[PDB]
Amino acid sequence: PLGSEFKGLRRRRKCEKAGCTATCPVCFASASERCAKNGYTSRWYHLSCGEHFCNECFDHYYRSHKDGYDKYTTWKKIWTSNGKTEPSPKAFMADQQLPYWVQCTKPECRKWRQLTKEIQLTPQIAKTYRCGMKTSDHCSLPEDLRVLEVSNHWWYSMLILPPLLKDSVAAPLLSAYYPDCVGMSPSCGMNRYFQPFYQPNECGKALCVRPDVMELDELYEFPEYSRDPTMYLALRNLILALWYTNCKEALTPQKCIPHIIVRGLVRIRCVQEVERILYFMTRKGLINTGVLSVGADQYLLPKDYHNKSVIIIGAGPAGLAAARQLHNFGIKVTVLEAKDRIGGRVWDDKSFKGVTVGRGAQIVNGCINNPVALMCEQLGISMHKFGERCDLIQEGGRITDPTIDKRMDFHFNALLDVVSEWRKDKTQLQDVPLGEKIEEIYKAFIKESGIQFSELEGQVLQFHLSNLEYACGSNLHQVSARSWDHNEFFAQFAGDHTLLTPGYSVIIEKLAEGLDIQLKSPVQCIDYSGDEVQVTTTDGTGYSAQKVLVTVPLALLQKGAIQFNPPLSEKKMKAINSLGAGIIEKIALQFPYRFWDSKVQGADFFGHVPPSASKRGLFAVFYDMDPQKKHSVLMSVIAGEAVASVRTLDDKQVLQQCMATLRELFKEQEVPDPTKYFVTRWSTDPWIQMAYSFVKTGGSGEAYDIIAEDIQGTVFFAGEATNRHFPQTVTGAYLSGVREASKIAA
Numbered sequence: 001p002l003g004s005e006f007k008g009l010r011r012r013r014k015c016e017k018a019g020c021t022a023t024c025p026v027c028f029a030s031a032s033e034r035c036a037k038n039g040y041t042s043r044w045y046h047l048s049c050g051e052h053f054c055n056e057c058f059d060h061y062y063r064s065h066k067d068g069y070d071k072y073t074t075w076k077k078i079w080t081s082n083g084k085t086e087p088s089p090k091a092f093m094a095d096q097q098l099p100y101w102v103q104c105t106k107p108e109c110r111k112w113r114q115l116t117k118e119i120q121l122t123p124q125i126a127k128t129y130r131c132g133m134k135t136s137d138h139c140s141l142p143e144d145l146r147v148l149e150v151s152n153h154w155w156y157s158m159l160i161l162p163p164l165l166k167d168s169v170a171a172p173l174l175s176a177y178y179p180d181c182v183g184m185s186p187s188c189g190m191n192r193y194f195q196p197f198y199q200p201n202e203c204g205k206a207l208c209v210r211p212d213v214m215e216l217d218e219l220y221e222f223p224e225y226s227r228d229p230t231m232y233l234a235l236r237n238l239i240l241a242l243w244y245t246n247c248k249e250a251l252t253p254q255k256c257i258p259h260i261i262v263r264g265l266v267r268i269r270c271v272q273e274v275e276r277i278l279y280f281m282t283r284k285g286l287i288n289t290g291v292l293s294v295g296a297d298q299y300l301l302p303k304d305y306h307n308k309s310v311i312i313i314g315a316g317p318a319g320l321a322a323a324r325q326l327h328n329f330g331i332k333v334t335v336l337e338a339k340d341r342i343g344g345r346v347w348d349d350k351s352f353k354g355v356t357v358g359r360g361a362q363i364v365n366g367c368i369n370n371p372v373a374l375m376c377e378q379l380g381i382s383m384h385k386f387g388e389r390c391d392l393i394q395e396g397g398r399i400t401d402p403t404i405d406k407r408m409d410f411h412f413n414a415l416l417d418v419v420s421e422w423r424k425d426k427t428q429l430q431d432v433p434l435g436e437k438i439e440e441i442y443k444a445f446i447k448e449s450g451i452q453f454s455e456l457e458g459q460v461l462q463f464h465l466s467n468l469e470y471a472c473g474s475n476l477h478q479v480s481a482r483s484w485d486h487n488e489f490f491a492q493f494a495g496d497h498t499l500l501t502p503g504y505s506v507i508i509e510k511l512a513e514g515l516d517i518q519l520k521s522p523v524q525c526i527d528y529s530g531d532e533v534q535v536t537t538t539d540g541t542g543y544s545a546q547k548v549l550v551t552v553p554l555a556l557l558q559k560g561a562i563q564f565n566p567p568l569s570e571k572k573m574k575a576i577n578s579l580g581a582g583i584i585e586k587i588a589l590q591f592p593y594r595f596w597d598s599k600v601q602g603a604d605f606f607g608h609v610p611p612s613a614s615k616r617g618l619f620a621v622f623y624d625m626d627p628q629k630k631h632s633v634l635m636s637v638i639a640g641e642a643v644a645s646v647r648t649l650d651d652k653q654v655l656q657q658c659m660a661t662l663r664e665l666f667k668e669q670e671v672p673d674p675t676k677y678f679v680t681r682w683s684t685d686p687w688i689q690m691a692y693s694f695v696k697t698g699g700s701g702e703a704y705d706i707i708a709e710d711i712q713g714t715v716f717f718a719g720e721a722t723n724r725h726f727p728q729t730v731t732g733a734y735l736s737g738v739r740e741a742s743k744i745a746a
């Protein structure tokens with residue numbers, strides 16, 4: 001840079017492009033008669049640092065009277081119709097003319113190799129190729145010096161055009177996009193729950209990935225693709241397509257390489273990258289997950305993610321998820337569970353005749369891309385889709401006219417809309433309870449326009465209100481007007497809502513196969529003061545490890561059953577208290593026959609229009625628990641103020657109320673006695689004491705995030721109440737565990 005005023009002695013570079021490192025640009029395409037081979041040309045053309053072509057081969061295709069113009073102009077037409085990106089002699093050489101490169105099969109060699117001008121590269125070739133194919137010892141011939149060049153840092157920046165894969169496995173799924181925008185060349189069956197790519201311009205599908213844009217986390221891990229995401233996108237999309245093509249078996253770099261097909265040396269960069277990005281996606285849980293296991297000497301991450309030690313508190317969905325993930329990564333993992341069984345708020349009763357009923361979760365709310373859907377695939381497990389019909393039954397007997405509900409649903413929704421319009425102005429400090437805000441708005445839509453409602457119309461309204469109480473997990477006077485539906489504005493899991501007939505506990509028992517799980521051992525103290533962390537069970541037993549993951553229910557953090565040393569942030573404590581620990585309660589009844597068949601008519605559920613507003617949560621809905629319509633088990637939900645009105649009376653007293661209600665719903669017929677039954681008491685299961693979280697009034701959705709933030713890279717949190725995007729659910733919990741495993745493994 002200094003002493004270069006003199007044109008006379010400035011440096012002479014043979015390639016015009018600034019920063020090329022080839023001092024002797026040879027030509028790769030003896031395509032004209034007067035190819036300048038290694039000799040002189042008026043201009044060199046830069047493709048990569050080890051790939052150039054001379055001015056005569058440029059003209060041989062670009063000029064009208066020359067005899068390449070045919071082949072090139074045929075290409076140029078297809079390109080502009082099938083692609084968004086501009087067609088140039090440069091792009092043409094890259095797409096059409098560059099020789100293909102291939103690695104040797106035998107473990108000794110593994111040398112890269114140029115192929116001949118006519119050999120077209122295919123997966124079978126790459127899968128098997130050894131040195132010399134269409135005697136001697138080819139496997140000693142020196143590797144081309146250009147090959148060592150590509151794994152060098154700066155080499156990709158000197159590539160002039162992004163690589164576009166050919167015949168990508170991801171090409172079916174991506175047909176709605178211009179191939180260039182997706183990293184495939186312009187010149188060219190699975191599971192229905194698995195739609196993994198957004199279609200152009202579509203939004204609001206959970207867990208869908210944009211095929212043509214890098215996510216933010218992807219950009220932070222691979223900053224080298226800020227300039228041009230194309231190579232990354234193509235490789236990432238390919239990896240996805242491969243995994244949803246077969247998810248019962250671990251996707252390795254070896255299965256990916258045969259499908260990376262590009263002209264040029266770029267292919268060497270591509271098979272090098274594919275390994276790094278496949279490992280990034282295995283950490284984040286994008287692939288090689290669910291209930292896949294491995295087991296035993298073979299792991300899912302390079303040995304340098306090993307010799308970290310983790311202790312996980314809680315054997316619930318979130319805990320177990322994190323544990324499968326870590327154990328599959330090759331990390332050393334111990335789970336301590338308080339109770340005498342794994343599963344947590346997942347606990348399936350199998351003692352019923354021919355049916356399994358969940359005391360805990362049993363429903364899947366949106367199957368498209370749901371981890372639970374995936375896991376049902378790997379396990380060969382069928383899940384039943386709910387039907388639309390659900391007529392609401394008055395006591396005693398008459399099925400409410402659909403046009404009544406259809407109009408009471410309008411008004412109920414219109415009330416929420418006025419609430420949500422009133423929010424826009426209010427801060428956290430001005431939050432009021434949702435139920436108070438509803439009641440008020442109602443009373444002055446009545447006192448306003450004198451249009452008053454029938455007694456039934458009023459009861460049907462209460463039925464809708466009852467549903468919110470089930471959704472929120474508490475009486476509406478506790479839930480935030482400002483944030484009750486905070487999570488609905490993020491993308492939601494599309495698709496079927498389904499009953500999980502075998503019950504969540506089969507996917508939880510499988511998650512937990514062959515893991516170090518200590519039961520009957522509740523944690524009492526977590527000391528992260530020293531170098532590693534020191535956890536102590538109530539009885540005295542000490543456990544130590546490098547990092548710790550707590551997956552404990554929100555209610556147990558709120559009433560500090562774990563001593564933190566140092567103690568938790570004040571900002572973290574306000575968040576933990578910002579949320580409400582919701583309850584509902586379940587009752588399941590086994591009858592000698594399906595007494596409801598004549599009235600209900602094979603529907604999946606039926607509704608119970610509540611007599612007084614006071615009792616709106618007392619058996620609001622009954623669920624047919626055999627989709628085969630063969631057995632007779634009904635299950636029902638106790639929500640809102642009804643949950644409190646039942647904490648005092650014993651099981652057989654709540655049974656009797658439910659039977660009173662069923663006898664009133666079927667007034668004009670007989671109903672038999674239950675043979676078998678249960679009533680859940682989650683409220684008072686010492687080690688859970690809740691059902692799911694919600695935003696207490698005064699809170700905000702942001703609290704889930706604060707609870708999720710780790711402490712000093714040593715203490716991590718997962719669980720249903722750490723997941724702001726997907727709260728409450730078994731799938732939301734599972735995800736959070738996978739999320740923290742990703743963090744820990746890093």
Ligand SMILES: Cc1cc2nc3c(=O)[nH]c(=O)nc-3n(C[C@H](O)[C@H](O)[C@H](O)COP(=O)(O)OP(=O)(O)OC[C@H]3O[C@@H](n4cnc5c(N)ncnc54)[C@H](O)[C@@H]3O)c2cc1C
Nearest residue numbers: 314316317318338344345361363522523719720728729730
């Ligand atoms: C009646 C009911 C119905 C539900 N319905 C559905 C549904 O239909 N669909 C759905 O998706 N979800 C449903 N849910 C919610 C769902 O079950 C939870 O979101 C999910 O189970 C949360 O799992 P988790 O891993 O966050 O914690 P949990 O499943 O709550 O497990 C936490 C574990 O922590 C352990 N623990 C607590 N303290 C300690 C300690 N000090 N030391 C060691 N271990 C400790 C507990 O023993 C427990 O095993 C329902 C829940 C209930 C109770």
Ligand SMILES: [Cl-]
Nearest residue numbers: 017044045046
């Ligand atoms: Cl150039």
Ligand SMILES: [Cl-]
Nearest residue numbers: 123127255258
């Ligand atoms: Cl294959």
Ligand code: NA
Nearest residue numbers: 528529530531
């Ligand atoms: Na520490």
Ligand SMILES: [Zn+2]
Nearest residue numbers: 015017020046
């Ligand atoms: Zn150059």
Ligand SMILES: [Zn+2]
Nearest residue numbers: 027035054057
């Ligand atoms: Zn040439």
Ligand SMILES: [Zn+2]
Nearest residue numbers: 104109131139
């Ligand atoms: Zn070889």
